[PDB]
Amino acid sequence: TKPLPTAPMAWAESSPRELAGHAPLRRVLRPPIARRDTRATRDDTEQAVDKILRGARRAGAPRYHLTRQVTLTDLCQPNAERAGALLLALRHPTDLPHLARHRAPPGRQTERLAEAWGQLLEASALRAGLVSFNFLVAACAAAYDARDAAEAVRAHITTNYGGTRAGARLDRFSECLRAMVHTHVFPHEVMRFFGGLVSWVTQDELASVTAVCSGPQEATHTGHPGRPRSAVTIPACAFVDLDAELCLGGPGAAFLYLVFTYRQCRDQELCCVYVVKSQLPPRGLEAALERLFGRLRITNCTYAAFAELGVMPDDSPRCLHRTERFGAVGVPVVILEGVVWRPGGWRACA
Amino acid sequence: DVEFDALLGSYCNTLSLVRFLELGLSVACVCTKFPELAYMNEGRVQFEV
């Protein structure tokens, strides 16, 4: 509002270069071508009408695409988890007892997935919905290498999610996912990316979750004008660098990646989700997945499956490693800063 | 020693501007102008012989 830092203050208005185009086109000239040669309220609501008028005279800001989806709150909760978390969408679940009957290798139980899903609708009772990311860590908590924070993600979810015996879902939904590895319908064939949290509307058993399906994170209309700011929070069981493990300390934009790992053994199968920050392109990524995840490849003919997640466009990308309190339990949480979401497709690696 | 280089002169052109109505061919035309054509669907002409 007309300050006196006018070297850059005019450039924060979007400028004087708006007249750069407006002068020889609109200010001059007769060309297109010429010839040759009653005490408090109103003004309280009256400035609100003026605020409509201040918004109507003119119509930098990068674009978004917000999505909303009405979501039953059995497996996921937008309530316990704050704005700036990953979410994951799903498909319909009665295709699970059908595709496992034909995609299995010969010599396995094709009736394993058909019974394991009904035991989750009969355990979350004590439909392409949603699974939040933090809920998915505590289910796959029994397969990690940093198991202590895996036992901290499970430490709050049984006490903070809406429902009774969420740990009975955690022990059953992971039993569903351990049946996905056996019945050969892999969970990357089910899990679909859904953007980061900005706002959510609550009701009985259903929630209206709003998220950014594409764009930057830090400037979204979060809804609260007191805090229209949110950062991305990830538990430390999943966050795997490939800058330190490959000694690439050179600066540049880092790419975020969702990665599954598979382990097929006879009734001893595991699930792990990892978010991978790398400076690698997607064409030069699988060679690093060969290096770290070759133990699961020898013991199994896929071993991993990944997809793109977003780009930190900083020349030096910025990470954090803190312990936030979701309810009453401190979980070691990796916080990413300056994150721009762009999704992508999946990949098989037999 | 003393030396130069030099420009000796420079020469533009003049684009000829040709009004269409200067040309004998305008005989074959009957030109009129809608200020709005684009708002028109099929136009017609009636004859009677």
Partner: protein, 286 residues
């Protein structure tokens, strides 16, 4: 950015309503250009191709989703350019499959079951916008059906998507229409697995690569090699020039059969599932 497709005059009452029926349906235009004729869109311009021919021609042409359809011109917004400019365009389902939220959508020539303008005497075949996980399955089923018709099964005619039953049968035209794919898929495999059979017994050189080979071939590939060579036998064969013509052919079928998405569906204030026949808010830009 938006291109125009001029309708030639002389359109009847039902044929002008026929272009009104196809509001948000896909159109391939050859070059992004401001003015463009309606003969270029039409099925006559594709010469006539089979389903291997149309998949080549959907990779050269530039897809545009039709926006508002005026009586004089058809307005088309292209996907590669103006959809990075214009954010969201509506797009109408013609598939029997309901589009869910956030699906990578590809387009497929209409193999299953087509507006013909009688006053103009040209047909407009539109592709069928179904998502990429089905697009890689339905073509792979229809190729695999074509091989069992080259000597079927009780299965393979039925697909389940989103709890709904799909029917590929609903046919003798379809099996001969898709036949030039099948003669390429059979050729690209049988030339492949003989070059493997003619080079692993030719070299089997041990640095560690044969140690990586034969251990991975330990009753997996070498037993598969021996069971092939049991159904086989063990001059100079023109081996090293057959690699080149196969790699140039094998890398070419991967791009026809890729069926890459253009469209992602970020719905907002709407249903998460777009039904068949309805319009879906469609973006291609992040």
């Amino acid at each position: 950015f938006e291109a125009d497709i001029a309708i030639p005059s002389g359109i009847s009452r039902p044929d002008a309503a026929a272009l009104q029926r196809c509001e948000g349906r896909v159109v391939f235009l050859p070059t992004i250009r401001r003015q463009l004729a309606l003969a270029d869109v039409a099925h006559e311009s594709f010469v006539s191709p089979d389903t291997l021919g149309l998949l080549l021609a959907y990779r050269r042409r530039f897809p545009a989703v039709i926006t508002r359809v005026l009586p004089t011109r058809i307005v088309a917004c292209p996907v590669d350019l103006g959809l990075t400019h214009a954010g969201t365009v509506n797009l109408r389902n013609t598939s029997p499959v309901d589009l869910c939220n956030g699906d990578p959508v590809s387009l497929v020539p209409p193999v299953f079951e087509d507006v013909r303008l009688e006053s103009l005497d040209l047909t407009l075949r539109f592709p069928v916008p179904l998502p990429t996980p089905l697009a890689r399955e339905i073509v792979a089923r229809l190729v695999a059906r074509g091989i069992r018709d080259l000597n079927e099964l009780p299965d393979l005619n039925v697909l389940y998507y989103n709890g709904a039953r799909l029917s590929l049968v609903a046919l003798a035209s379809v099996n001969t229409e898709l036949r030039s794919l099948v003669l390429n898929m059979v050729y690209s495999i049988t030339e492949g697995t003989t070059l493997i059979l003619t080079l692993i017994p030719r070299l089997l050189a041990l640095g560690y690569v044969n140690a990586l080979l034969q251990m991975q071939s330990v009753t997996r590939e070498a037993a598969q090699l021996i069971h092939p060579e049991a159904p086989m036998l063990m001059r100079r064969l023109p081996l090293y020039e057959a690699l080149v013509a196969w790699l140039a052919h094998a890398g070419q079928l991967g791009d026809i059969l890729a069926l890459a998405p253009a469209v992602r569906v970020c719905t907002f204030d709407g249903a998460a599932v777009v039904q068949s026949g309805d319009m879906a808010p469609v973006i291609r830009y992040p």
